[PDB]
Design brief:
The complex is a heterodimer of chains A (414) and B (79). By secondary structure, chain A is mainly alpha-helical. Chain A is built from 16 helices and no strands. Chain A has 2 domains: 180 residues, no CATH class; 216 residues, no CATH class. In chain A, 73% of the residues lie in helices and 0% in strands. The radius of gyration of chain A is 23 Å and the shape is globular. The relative contact order of chain A is 0.08. By secondary structure, chain B is mostly helical. Chain B has a single domain, classed as Non-ribosomal Peptide Synthetase Peptidyl Carrier Protein, Chain A, CATH 1.10.1200. Chain B is globular. Chain B starts with a helix and ends with a helix. Classes of the chains: A mainly alpha (414), B mainly alpha (79). At the A-B interface, helix 12 and helix 13 of A face helix 3 of B. Chain A: One of its GO terms (cellular component) is plasma membrane. Chain A: GO terms for molecular function: acyltransferase activity. Chain A: Its EC number is 2.3.1.-. Chain A: InterPro entries: Ac/AlaTfrase_AlgI/DltB, DltB, MB_O-acyltransferase, MBOAT_fam.
Chain lengths: 414, 79
């Protein structure tokens, strides 16, 4: 039966421009449908499942069963908590349920540590789907969620545009968006938006990321490995080439997802907002992988801070924040995987954000120490801004060198 | 005490600024509450009012003025 799925046809999600002809034809009824305030429940479910299955039917086509396990597993625990949270409500019951919901994803991440192989529970979207699932567990806990169909829940948790690696969503907003179809002019406004996003994505992914990714990066790596040592000028090379590739590949993908999402009526959250022109490490995370960043803000960061203030575990205002940054970004690192360089990239932005936070407050203390001394406030102009942007950009790019795990091949061929 | 007059006390208890009669002030715009100040107020609102108020759903538009915190305290006190 595993053999049947490896026999089954396979389509790379936004893998070629040819993919859109299918998905276009496929989405076409749904979109026309929205103009008459109609959704085709069964058809949407069909088209969703086919393109999801096609995305998961590679050489490791077995992963589709891993998905179905995952769905049953999620329904079991999502509803377990729904049923519980109706009557009573406890800290530790919530904790347990959260852990159980994330557990498949934890096993997937931990499996190469213990073994050297992927988990059997591993399928493609697992990393991004888990957020959607825990989302509800957290939201029921807060009492901001009470009602939902298994329909509503599955619709949200296994949404097809944002499945593979797409923009992360929250239930309440998604369901609200799906609940009322947008009116005629607003709707084909989304068509304009979609055709824009598809075209930009074509350039971003197939052209620009092609140049950085498959054209310039592989020889530069070969050069950097040839020259050896802790660093070299070709390693500074791979730092920027990858950095742009990582950006274009993902940002283009995101736009694709957003566009396809728009063609299914709903407007999914945005992942990038010109992240490189950011002056600040704080501003970078308001501009880079935003859906992931914004999620981690409101679910991992804000929630850990609330704990460190309910308990008042740390002495002053600033240290609670700094522990929160470090832990919060470190979790995100683990989210990418349990490899040294992910946890490293984790702690990098951790210490990064603490540095950044302390400097902002040190800038006010130097402005208080001058304005009350007789001098004019320390200069802020065009070249100061530019310097910030320059410093931020290189810190960011360096983190991407860490994140690539190219350093793993450069330092430890061994 | 009333659910408007008691919030008036605590606001200047660990920040030191009065917004009684002019209360529709955006306190993020006023410079009273910072990025880490909200949590400090919400924890003393958690303690003194005995009310647990959620943070995953908290947005910038929601609880920004001293009126939209007073009117949000009465809503999460009974229903």
């Amino acid at each position: 039966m595993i053999d049947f799925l490896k026999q089954l046809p396979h389509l790379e999600p936004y893998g070629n421009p040819f993919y859109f002809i299918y998905l276009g034809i496929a989405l076409l009824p749904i979109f026309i449908g929205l103009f008459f305030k109609k959704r085709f429940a069964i058809y949407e479910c069909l088209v969703s499942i086919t393109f999801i299955v096609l995305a998961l039917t590679g050489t490791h086509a077995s992963q589709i069963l891993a998905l179905l396990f995952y769905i049953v597993w999620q329904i079991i625990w999502v509803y377990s908590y729904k049923r519980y949270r109706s009557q009573r409500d406890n800290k530790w019951v919530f904790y347990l349920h959260s852990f159980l919901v994330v557990l498949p994803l934890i096993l997937v991440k931990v499996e190469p540590t213990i073994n050297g192989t992927q988990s059997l529970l591993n399928f493609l979207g697992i990393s991004y789907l888990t957020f959607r699932a825990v989302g509800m567990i957290i939201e029921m806990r807060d009492g901001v969620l009470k009602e939902f169909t298994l329909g509503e829940f599955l619709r949200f948790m296994l949404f097809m545009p944002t499945f593979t690696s797409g923009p992360i969503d929250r239930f309440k907003r998604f369901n609200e968006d799906y609940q009322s179809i947008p009116n005629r002019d607003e709707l084909l406004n989304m068509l304009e938006q979609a055709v824009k996003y598809i075209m930009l994505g074509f350039l971003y992914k197939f052209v620009l990321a092609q140049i950085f990714g498959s054209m310039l990066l592989p020889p530069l790596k070969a050069q950097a490995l040839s020259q050896g040592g802790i660093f070299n000028l070709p390693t500074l090379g791979v730092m920027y080439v990858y950095g742009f590739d990582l950006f274009f590949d993902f940002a283009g993908y995101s736009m694709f997802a957003l566009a396809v999402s728009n063609l299914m009526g709903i407007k999914s959250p945005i992942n990038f907002d010109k992240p490189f022109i950011s002056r600040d490490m704080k501003e970078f995370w308001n501009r880079w992988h935003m859906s992931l960043s914004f999620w981690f803000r409101d679910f991992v960061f804000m929630r850990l801070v609330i704990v460190l203030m309910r308990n008042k575990v740390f002495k002053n205002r600033n240290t609670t924040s700094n522990v929160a940054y470090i832990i919060n970004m470190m979790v995100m690192g683990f989210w990418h995987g349990i490899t040294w360089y992910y946890i490293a990239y984790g702690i990098f932005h951790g210490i990064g954000l603490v540095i950044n936070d302390a400097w902002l407050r040190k800038k006010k203390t130097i402005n208080k120490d001058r304005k009350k001394a007789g001098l004019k406030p320390l200069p802020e102009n065009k070249w100061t801004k530019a310097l910030g942007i320059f410093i931020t950009f290189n810190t960011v790019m360096l983190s991407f060198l860490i994140f690539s795990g190219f350093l793993n091949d450069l330092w430890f061929t061994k | 005490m009333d659910v408007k007059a008691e919030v008036i006390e605590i606001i200047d208890e660990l920040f030191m600024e009065d917004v009684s009669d002019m209360m529709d002030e955006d306190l993020f715009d006023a410079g009273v509450l910072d990025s880490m100040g909200t949590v400090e107020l919400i924890v003393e609102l958690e303690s003194r009012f005995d009310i647990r108020v959620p943070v995953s759903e908290f947005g910038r538009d929601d609880w920004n003025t001293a009126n939209k915190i007073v009117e949000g305290v009465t809503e999460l006190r009974n229903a």
